[PDB]
Amino acid sequence: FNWKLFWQFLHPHLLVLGVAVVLALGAALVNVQIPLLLGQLTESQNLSTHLLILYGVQGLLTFGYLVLLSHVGERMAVDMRRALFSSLLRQDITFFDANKTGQLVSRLTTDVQEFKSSFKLVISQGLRSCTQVLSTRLTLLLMVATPALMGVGTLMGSGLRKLSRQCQEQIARAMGVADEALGNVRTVRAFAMEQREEERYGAELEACRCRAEELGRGIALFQGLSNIAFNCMVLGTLFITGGDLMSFLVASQTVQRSMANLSVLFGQVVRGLSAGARVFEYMALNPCIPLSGGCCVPKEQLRGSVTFQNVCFSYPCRPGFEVLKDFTLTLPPGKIVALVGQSGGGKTTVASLLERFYDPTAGVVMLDGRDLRTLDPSWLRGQVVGFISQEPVLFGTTIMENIRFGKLEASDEEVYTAAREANAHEFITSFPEGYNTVVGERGTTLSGGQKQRLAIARALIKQPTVLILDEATSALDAESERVVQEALDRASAGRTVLVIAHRLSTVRGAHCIVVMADGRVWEAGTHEELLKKGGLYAELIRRQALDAAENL
Amino acid sequence: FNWKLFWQFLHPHLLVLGVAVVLALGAALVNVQIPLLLGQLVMTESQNLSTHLLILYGVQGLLTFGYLVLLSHVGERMAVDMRRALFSSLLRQDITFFDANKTGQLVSRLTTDVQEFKSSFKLVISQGLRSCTQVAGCLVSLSMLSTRLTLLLMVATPALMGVGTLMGSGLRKLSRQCQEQIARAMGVADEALGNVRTVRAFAMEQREEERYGAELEACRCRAEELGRGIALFQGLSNIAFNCMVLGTLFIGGSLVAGQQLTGGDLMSFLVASQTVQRSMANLSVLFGQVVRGLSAGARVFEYMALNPCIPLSGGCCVPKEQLRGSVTFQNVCFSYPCRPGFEVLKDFTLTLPPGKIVALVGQSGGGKTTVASLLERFYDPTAGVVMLDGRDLRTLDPSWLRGQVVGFISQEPVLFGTTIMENIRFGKLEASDEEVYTAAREANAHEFITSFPEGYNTVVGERGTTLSGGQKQRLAIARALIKQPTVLILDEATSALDAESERVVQEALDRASAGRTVLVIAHRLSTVRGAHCIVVMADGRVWEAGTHEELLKKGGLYAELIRRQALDAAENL
Ligand SMILES: CC(C)CCC[C@@H](C)[C@H]1CC[C@H]2[C@@H]3CC=C4C[C@@H](OC(=O)CCC(=O)O)CC[C@]4(C)[C@H]3CC[C@]12C
Ligand SMILES: Nc1ncnc2c1ncn2[C@@H]1O[C@H](COP(=O)(O)OP(=O)(O)O)[C@@H](O)[C@H]1O
Ligand SMILES: Nc1ncnc2c1ncn2[C@@H]1O[C@H](COP(=O)(O)OP(=O)(O)O)[C@@H](O)[C@H]1O
Ligand SMILES: [Mg+2]
Ligand SMILES: [Mg+2]
């Protein structure tokens, strides 16, 4: 896994890598003749011009060998970042709840560069140092191979890998304290608890040093023992022609100086290998639910009948705490089914199961008789179901491209037709640039009602058969709430709609209402049926009628 | 700024740093006697010398370990002092900065850039000290009084070229352009992975991979340009040194014939320069790290030196006996620093009586939340003044005001990743366990907190138990009540709350609003009906003002708002 995947990225760049080896051997080959011709120095002018040619040749051989190594290292990094980001996006929602967004961005950009630059330095110094280095040759090569093997034959006992893993654990822990403090700085200032956050970070900061000093003392232990191991190798080979033994002792002294350069970079070797291990860690991960694995149903066959049969669910984070318990509900095609209940009853959880973000622990969820497990998730989310959350998410691009997120192969004329259906075209045209206006952090800040109107137009381009509306008009102002709801009803026409609303006034004219308590269907039926039943709905609407009469 | 602040962190660790220099000079000193004593060796006579040589190896290894440990200790302790000073300076920066700079990039500059500099500083001294001791040992042993000056000059030449190019318009602009694209591609990943749920909902994953992939090839493009640039310096530096050898050979050679310098000195210098060439080559390899390290080190000291417009402790405190709670806005004009042209607040004049609850109503984007942020002194007005009991907020201690005088309640509450008891305790730092429960009972929070298995020891947030909108807001009320506020801001506290939860939270807020100056910015006009007076905002100015009955009799903006509310109420019946 560590070296099996590493070879896959190195293999295409290996041809370019070989050219740099030749250039490095040739560069130090010119360096051998440099003091040779210097010792020899009209006779002077012929030799001085000759020496100036050799400097430019060595300087060109060194530059090229360093440029090729920088090119191989950077191109290998892009292939790793491309493969990791693709594998990260494929990962299920359970993983994104367990792992912070900040640490994932760091593993994708910092850890890759930490390995890349470390890989560059080991070959840059290694190749240069090794080029500076019949019977004496065999004994010399034997002494170079020993610290490369012995540094692994000793790594079997105490593990420098456990020290770096403990160091990376505290590095991410202190990183999360800074992200929570600086990210919610406005809330920190509000209650003027800055010195408390500095203390909370300061404590994690001294622990950050503590674990790094332990690894630091560990890396220094290897470097020190490696110096003793080499000097003992000299004494070992001395006891294991007389002119060869005499020459070898001077030759080992030259290797000792060259091996010392690699022993200095051992700290980078640890840091770099630990870095790349984390890059290949999340790259190999396979999610529970795939993205392309399934079957598609044509628009001529798809009617839009959603059926939940004895669906029991519990989140993978809390396997004990049951969210949905024996939940049975069937949505008729074209009919608008309302969903009412207490906060924490599993309302938003029901919706996420239909979008197939998670699969039930018991029972099945079916779309027109076909189970969602056998269906293609990308097809279901991207062409069948249209989701609308209580808080809309707008990317850092233009308004025209932000709506175009619904259907990839959608024309410019398709966006304006979709925007007119969600009463968005009226206020978008009013802007100076209009549809070419950027939105988000860098772009123009938009009101709650304006943002939600854009989200409706986004979900309408893909022409959905099923529509989920989870508290679409939650934190909207009285005026904006009336506008957005009016456009939502127009989009609800001729579609299967699962309305999860807080305002009971909009769910009064639905196909049927589903009251939910402790993840179970508590009450079900039409508006009149649930009033005649005298249940939870009747008590809820009784309190609603008293509040309404008081406002008149 | 780059070196002026750098010396402040290096100065206390300089004493420990000097000890490591001595250990490195001693370790290479033993390495000189290693082939000297090994050459003497080439049964009892051998046993006495072999045991003696084994002692020398253990002494060399101990001097190598200690020198590396001291350098790791100095480097790590210096990093903590830098991270402590940067985080403190980052939190002090005004809100304008946090809107201009992303939270992710600030975390990276605080952790990654510090470690990028620290490990780079570690490597330059690790190789540099080891390599320089190999040169110092050869210099004292071979060179005479005249050959020493020529040797030291040849070492100082690439160092003069080294620093000079790093300060220039070449390498410095290439790394700045590389860091610009590094942060740009980082923002694409953060927007994609951060909003992954929305990306999946519309199944546009291949579009996000393409958007990142384009920024990823540009990330290589700018880094390859810097890579080709750093390699150009390394190559030219190799030519520069070999030309220096040719230069001193002709300069010194002219003095050799004139009996000024012996032939043995010139011959020794050429062997000495060849030893330095091998030592300088080790530092030339690390030049890529020198660029990377200095660029990252500059970014850390850039935001550390920054001074905000509004301080945190600079001001005066008003005693509880003098503090009544009278807020006054006198011809207050405000335009955000981001949009200096777009005027949000124009000639705002409002006075809040002490103990009285003043309601604030207006259209979405009329500058309602903007008024609230000016009272919390997040920003200062472009014209006019905001006064607390006759005293201007500019002369007042900001931390005293936010931490003891004003109690803010936002439409979306923010709960940290700690226990419930510690999350409420965010109000008053020196608050007892008994103070939290008394505050929780005042916000109807104690009733549902005790119901939990662990209770107050239950963690909340991402790792903790997820709480309902109404439950989260009830905790925020109890948090703001510990500091015992004189002024209270309620900005749409019951916005995204369910009909049932909305009635509970308001029932608590109303009791908390008793005997305090309250600025209620509510969307539901039904709760603002029983206030001291209602204010109406139009295009950033006070359009209509007066009591509930007064504004109805006036027949203005409030009358048209209460008319649309009456039509919505009849539809709910
Ligand atoms: C942490 C503090 C104390 C150091 C901050 C100053 C740096 C900007 C200096 C210190 C040592 C300098 C280095 C000392 C030696 C060299 C070798 C020199 O290359 C050669 O002479 C090699 C020639 C060859 O290839 O034969 C190129 C500049 C460089 C890397 C210098 C670049 C600038 C450095 C890193
Ligand atoms: N990501 C999650 N991880 C763990 N528990 C969750 C998660 N999302 C929701 N829950 C839990 O599931 C239950 C119902 O959630 P949800 O459907 O979001 O609420 P609501 O009925 O208000 O829409 C609650 O007990 C909540 O804590
Ligand atoms: N951080 C900000 N940067 C730039 N403009 C802002 C910012 N916050 C608010 N505004 C602008 O100020 C105006 C009023 O804002 P605000 O008080 O938040 O609205 P509301 O009246 O709905 O509460 C709007 O035009 C809005 O775009
Ligand atoms: Mg919900
Ligand atoms: Mg507001």
The two three-digit tokens of residue A472, written as one number: 């679409």
Task: For chain A, say whether B241 makes contact (Cβ under 8 Å).
Answer: no
Q: Which residues contact A194 (CB under 8 A, 6 or more apart)?
A: A188, B91, B92, B312, B399
CB atoms within 10 A of CB A532: 10
Task: Give the CA distances from residue A260 to residues A216, B256, B500, in Å, rounded to whole numbers and listed in that order.
Answer: 18, 37, 73
CA B480 / ligand 2 centre spacing (Å)? 27
Q: Give which of A353, A322, A325 is closest to A498, Cα–Cα.
A: A353
Domain boundary (B314, B348, B375) is at B314
3-state secondary structure of B517: strand
Breaks (C-N over 2.5 A) in chain A follow: 41, 133, 240
Q: Give which of B327, B342, B423 is closest to B377, Cα–Cα.
A: B327
Round to whole Å and give the CA distance between A511 and A275.
56
CA A345 / ligand 2 centre spacing (Å)? 8
Nearest Cα residue to atom 33 of ligand 1:
B162
Are residues B292 and B339 both part of a single domain? no
**Mutation to probe ligand 3, out of B336, B373, B539, B542 (largest number of atoms < 8 A from CB):** B336
Kindly determine whether residue B190 and residue A105, on different chains, have CB atoms separated by under 8 Å.
Answer: yes
Task: Give the CA distances from residue B144 to residues A67, A186, B151, in Å, rounded to whole numbers and listed in that order.
Answer: 40, 67, 10
Largest CA distance in chain B: 120
CB atoms within 10 A of CB A276: 21
What does B345-397 look like in DSSP terms, one character per residue? EEEEEEEE-TT-EEEEEE-TTSSHHHHHHHHTTSS--SEEEEEETTEETTTB-
Residue B149: is it exposed, middle or buried by C-beta count within 10 angstroms (0-12/13-18/19+)? exposed
- Which method resolved this structure? X-ray
The two three-digit tokens of residue A346, written as one number: 């599993």
Q: What is chain A's Cα-based Rg?
A: 34
CB atoms within 10 A of CB A392: 18
Nearest Cα residue to atom 30 of ligand 1:
B284
Residue B128: is it exposed, middle or buried by C-beta count within 10 angstroms (0-12/13-18/19+)? middle
Owning domain of residue B426: 315-573
CB atoms within 10 A of CB A223: 21
Q: Which atom number of ligand 2 is nearest to the Cα of residue A342?
A: 21
Query: Measured in whole angstroms, how far is the alpha carbon of residue B311 from the centre of its chain?
Result: 17
Return the H-helix or E-strand segment holding A232: helix A194-239
CB atoms within 10 A of CB A53: 9
Return the H-helix or E-strand segment holding B1: none
Kindly determine whether residue A213 and residue B566, on different chains, have CB atoms separated by under 8 Å.
Answer: no
Are residues A284 and A313 both part of a single domain? no
Task: Give the CA distances from residue A226 to residues A55, A326, B61, in Å, rounded to whole numbers and listed in that order.
Answer: 36, 65, 8
Strands lying side by side in the sheet with B383-388: B345-352, B327-334, B383-388, B391-392
Q: Which residues contact A226 (CB under 8 A, 6 or more apart)?
A: A147, A151, A263, A266
Round to whole Å and give the CA distance between A72 and A31.
25
The two three-digit tokens of residue B201, written as one number: 């909902």
CB atoms within 10 A of CB B46: 10
Are residues B326 and B305 both part of a single domain? no
A48, A58, A178 ranked by CB distance to B110: nearest: A178
Q: How many residues are present in chain A? A: 552
Are residues A322 and A335 both part of a single domain? yes
Breaks (C-N over 2.5 A) in chain B follow: 42
Shortest alpha-carbon distance between residue A367 and chain B (Å): 17
CB atoms within 10 A of CB B167: 12
Domain boundary (A234, A268, A293) is at A293
Round to whole Å and give the CA distance between A523 and A526.
10
Bridge partner residues of B61 (DSSP): none
A185: phi then psi, degrees, rounded to nearest 5: -55, -40
Residue A439: is it exposed, middle or buried by C-beta count within 10 angstroms (0-12/13-18/19+)? buried
Are residues A133 and A45 both part of a single domain? yes
3-state secondary structure of A81: helix
Q: Give which of B183, B473, B392 is closest to A105, Cα–Cα.
A: B183
Bridge partner residues of B359 (DSSP): B520, B534
Round to whole Å and give the CA distance between A35 and A21.
23
Largest CA distance in chain A: 120
Are residues B152 and B248 both part of a single domain? yes
Our answer on whether the CB atom of A85 is closer than 6 Å to any ligand 2 atom is no
Are residues A360 and A284 both part of a single domain? no
Are residues B324 and B408 both part of a single domain? yes
Strand A512-517 with A520-525, pairing: antiparallel
Are residues A253 and A315 both part of a single domain? no
Q: Where are the alpha helices (DSSP H) in B143-170?
A: 145-167
Are residues B185 and B324 both part of a single domain? no
Round to whole Å and give the CA distance between B109 and B179.
11
Q: Give which of A542, A544, A537, A539 is closest to A516, Cα–Cα.
A: A537
Round to whole Å and give the CA distance between A108 and A99.
13
First to last CA, chain A: 70
Rounded (to 5) percent helix, strand, coil in chain B:
65, 10, 25
Residues around ion ligand 5, judged by CB within 5 A, are: B 369
Round to whole Å and give the CA distance between A26 and A33.
11
Are residues A273 and A388 both part of a single domain? no
Are residues B253 and B188 both part of a single domain? yes
Task: For chain A, say whether B38 makes contact (Cβ under 8 Å).
Answer: yes
Q: Which residues contact A270 (CB under 8 A, 6 or more apart)?
A: A160, A164, A215, A219
Round to whole Å and give the CA distance between A422 and A490.
8
Domain count, chain A: 2
CATH of the domain at B451: 3.40.50.300
Q: Which residue has the tokens 């080790």?
A: B282
Task: Give the CA distances from residue B521 to residues A93, A390, B120, B347, B503, in Å, rounded to whole numbers and listed in that order.
Answer: 37, 21, 53, 19, 17
Return the H-helix or E-strand segment holding A462: none
The two three-digit tokens of residue B190, written as one number: 């953060």
